[PDB]
A paper describes a structure:
In this manuscript we demonstrate the feasibility of the method proving the Hb-DFO conjugation by X-ray crystallography and matrix-assisted laser desorption/ionization-time of flight mass spectrometry (MALDI-TOF MS), the quantitative 89Zr uptake by Hb-DFO using radiochromatographic methods and finally analyzing the biodistribution of the Hb-DFO-89Zr complex over time in naïve and lung tumor-bearing mice.
Two DFO molecules per Hb tetramer were identified as covalently bound to the β chain of the Hb tetramer by MALDI-TOF MS analysis. The electron density clearly shows a ferric form of Hb with water bound to the heme iron, except for one of the α subunits that has the heme group in double conformation, one of them being in the oxygenated form (50% occupancy). The map around the side chain of Cys93 of both β subunits clearly displays additional electron density corresponding to the maleimide moiety and the first six atoms of the DFO as a double conformer. Indeed, the chelating long chain is unstructured in the absence of a divalent metal, and crystallographic data do not show specific interactions that would lock it in a fixed conformation.
Residue numbers in the entry:
A (entry chain B), B (entry chain D): 1 to 146
C (entry chain C), D (entry chain A): 1 to 141
The structure:
Amino acid sequence: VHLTPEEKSAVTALWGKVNVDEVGGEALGRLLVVYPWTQRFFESFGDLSTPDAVMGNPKVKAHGKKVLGAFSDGLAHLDNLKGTFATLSELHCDKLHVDPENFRLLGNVLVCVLAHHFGKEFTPPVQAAYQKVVAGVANALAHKYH
Amino acid sequence: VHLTPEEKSAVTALWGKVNVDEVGGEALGRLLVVYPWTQRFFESFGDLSTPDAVMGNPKVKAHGKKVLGAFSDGLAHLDNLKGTFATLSELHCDKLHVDPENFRLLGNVLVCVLAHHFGKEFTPPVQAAYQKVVAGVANALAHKYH
Amino acid sequence: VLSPADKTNVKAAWGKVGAHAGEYGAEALERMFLSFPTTKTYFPHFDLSHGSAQVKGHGKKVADALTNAVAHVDDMPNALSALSDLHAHKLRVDPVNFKLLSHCLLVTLAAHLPAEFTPAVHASLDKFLASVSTVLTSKYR
Amino acid sequence: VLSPADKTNVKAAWGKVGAHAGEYGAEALERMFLSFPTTKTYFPHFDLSHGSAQVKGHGKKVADALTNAVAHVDDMPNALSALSDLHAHKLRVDPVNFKLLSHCLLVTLAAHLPAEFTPAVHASLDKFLASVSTVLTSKYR
Ligand code: HEM
Ligand code: HEM
Ligand code: HEM
Ligand code: HEM
Ligand SMILES: *[C@@H]1CC(=O)N(CCC(=O)NC)C1=O
Ligand SMILES: *[C@H]1CC(=O)N(CCC(=O)NC)C1=O
């Protein structure tokens, strides 16, 4: 995907502010609460019995750091998203059997998390730049599905 | 797109039996009837107010032949759909502003038309091969939207 | 919420399917599993091979639920109410998969009922199956 | 038909939005037009400039319909029924665009409701907007 210079700058400045220990768990926890069919894939993460249990779940926190790390890797490789998610695409398609529509949903949940945490700073232009990033990530993770 | 060689063979053999003057017209007319928001893009084609009106509309039939011709181009270039559909991708995105979700719908309608035309010959394996093709054509037409 | 028109076409098409409804349900499942293999993981205790007795038996249950939905077309929420709880709460079926099976049901009907599968009837069957899917996903609102 | 929990969560959230609903509807439209430029072709002879008085006028109409639907959650098909014939027949609004606007409404609410936009309230607002979108697309079903 191609961000304007304005857009790359905006994305990077906000991402600098992002808590890499927490925002991924917040996004994954909200996916599980908001779209509860997604819990089918994470039942081995243990207690998903209430929204607070999901958000406090240690496996959700831990795995969220890795999901956010994959987004940070993608932000550093906007030019080459297919290679930055090549085997992750195969993992989701062949081993996990995740429908790629859910990659769009997780991207949109992450956008809602950035809006919640950053408030008025997550301006319409900043959002538009992040929508290109999370679409680019979702398309890269869907590569092995087509 | 990744058809196996057997899937490419199955797709090519059936496509040889496709009536180039009629199937694109059938598929476009069923898109317009089944998903009526799509009529917004064909407001100059004349009366689309009943199924019979759509299926007998000469501009629908004429346009459908061009659409089927583009699928024929995709089937002759299955290892380079991105390049094959680059121009049409720009056209749909810049000048028509068609949401790419509709590319998936038209591909599914075409699959229903092939089933209607070939009966038991359109077996579950043949359909599975054609789903890979229409997903790859839609993906390729979506490229310039990203 | 189907229009008057839509109910007439659905009853006519499903009428001609007749005693084949189970067979067509089983074929639609087979088409789904082959076309969209992500869907196989919902049936881990099944033989999913061509002509599986278990897929034939499951096709009958799907077909019976659709037959019941056609008979209860004006009150589909109540006629499928337990099924929504099963699919959403217990099975956690991804909403996308209802679109996939619906598409595979339309393909099966087009392959077997060329005369009945007119553009009008196709549009009506799509609206009938989306409505069935909206009920089965309704514990996702 | 939202669950009791969802109805209570939506009313709580919408109460906090209060007199700002029109403001947030305009911002959500602005966000949609910039993030998803295909949506602009439904407003071909509108002023879509940042802070457009016209987009404010429209944002009011959208926010008012949502506020009315919050007050009529157990009878939303009836309360929005007007808008559904409009958006289907006259406007031919692509069902995907309802998902785009709904997402931009959630982003707007998140950016303005730091305390209220909890995971459970987010889930309920998503179900609420999806329910609105279903009524407004019902002439396709
Ligand atoms: C779209 C962005 C996504 C990204 C960047 C992503 C990233 C990852 C990564 C990096 C792993 C490997 C974890 C590890 O082995 O340490 C993984 C595993 C996994 N992902 Fe995703 N994923 C995404 C979306 C999804 C979605 C939407 C679902 C399901 C709804 C999903 C389900 C899973 C599951 C079940 C695992 C295995 C976790 C386990 O049991 O250890 N992912 N993903
Ligand atoms: C997914 C496969 C599709 C293919 C292969 C395709 C192909 C084409 C082609 C080849 C043309 C140029 C026709 C010419 O030479 O005059 C065209 C034009 C167009 N396409 Fe598509 N198309 C697809 C999907 C769609 C969809 C889903 C829509 C709308 C819902 C759409 C709307 C149009 C429109 C409005 C034009 C201009 C027609 C005119 O006014 O002459 N296309 N498309
Ligand atoms: C038209 C849509 C559908 C209908 C009418 C339908 C109907 C049914 C019925 C009647 C049952 C059996 C309930 C019982 O005997 O107590 C059932 C079970 C089930 N359905 Fe569906 N269903 C549909 C869509 C789906 C989809 C899309 C999936 C997954 C891709 C799915 C997965 C299942 C599973 C896993 C079972 C349990 C099977 C078992 O272990 O016996 N269904 N469905
Ligand atoms: C929550 C979703 C929505 C709500 C609550 C909503 C509500 C409304 C309302 C109240 C009106 C004005 C009715 C009147 O003029 O008397 C309207 C008009 C309109 N809506 Fe929607 N709408 C929604 C979604 C959409 C979407 C997604 C689109 C397009 C992407 C859209 C496009 C329009 C257009 C183009 C008009 C007419 C404006 C004009 O040309 O005058 N709406 N909507
Ligand atoms: C073709 C049509 C369109 O919208 N675009 C823009 C693609 C984009 O969003 N790039 C950042 C085209 O170039
Ligand atoms: C479906 C999911 C997946 O991983 N792939 C790519 C390679 C593969 O293992 N296919 C048999 C798909 O095509």
